[PDB]
Design a protein around this ligand. Structure first.
Ligand SMILES: COc1ccc(-n2cnnn2)cc1
Length: 153
């Protein structure tokens, strides 16, 4: 679809020239729908000094379906499982999710960045990590810092 291609061209230009702070997103080779991204570990978060790589697949029906995004770098977090799947509203269509064509790759990457800083323990993919975050936050922070040191630095 030509509407999809023109939209992806504009997004790649905006991601190259006005990337959100801490965020980088690029075409892996020669396909505008096979992308990668990088989110820097946030300051005053256990991920600080970590560098986290993600895969960003643009589906056929984009912008009417959300980008398909998974972490390639392991991360220790209530809402991200050990295969890097992400539980986040803007990555799912209504009624459960909040994706709409007014959002874009940069918006949802920023949403992931914020999720890293502020987990949603009510919708976990890792129940035990989530309980740890809710009830033993110092142990969570230490385990998140250790996971970051082993896998993201
Ligand atoms: C609160 O709205 C939600 C939207 C999406 C999820 N998902 C989590 N993992 N896949 N989808 C959970 C809650």
């Amino acid at each position: 679809s030509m509407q999809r291609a023109s939209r992806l061209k504009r997004e790649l230009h905006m991601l190259a020239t006005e990337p959100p702070p801490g965020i980088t997103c690029w075409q892996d080779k020669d396909q505008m729908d096979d992308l990668r991204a990088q989110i820097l570990g946030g300051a005053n978060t256990p991920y600080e000094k970590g560098v986290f790589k993600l895969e960003v697949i643009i589906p056929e029906r984009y912008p009417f379906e959300p980008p398909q995004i998974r972490f390639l770098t392991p991360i220790y977090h209530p809402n991200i499982d050990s295969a890097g799947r992400i539980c986040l509203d803007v990555l799912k269509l209504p009624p459960k999710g909040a994706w709409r064509p007014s959002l874009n790759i940069a918006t949802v990457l920023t949403s992931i960045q914020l999720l890293m800083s502020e987990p949603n323990p009510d919708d976990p993919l890792m129940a035990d990590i989530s309980s740890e975050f809710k009830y033993n936050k110092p142990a969570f922070l230490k385990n998140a810092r250790q996971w970051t040191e082993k896998h993201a630095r």
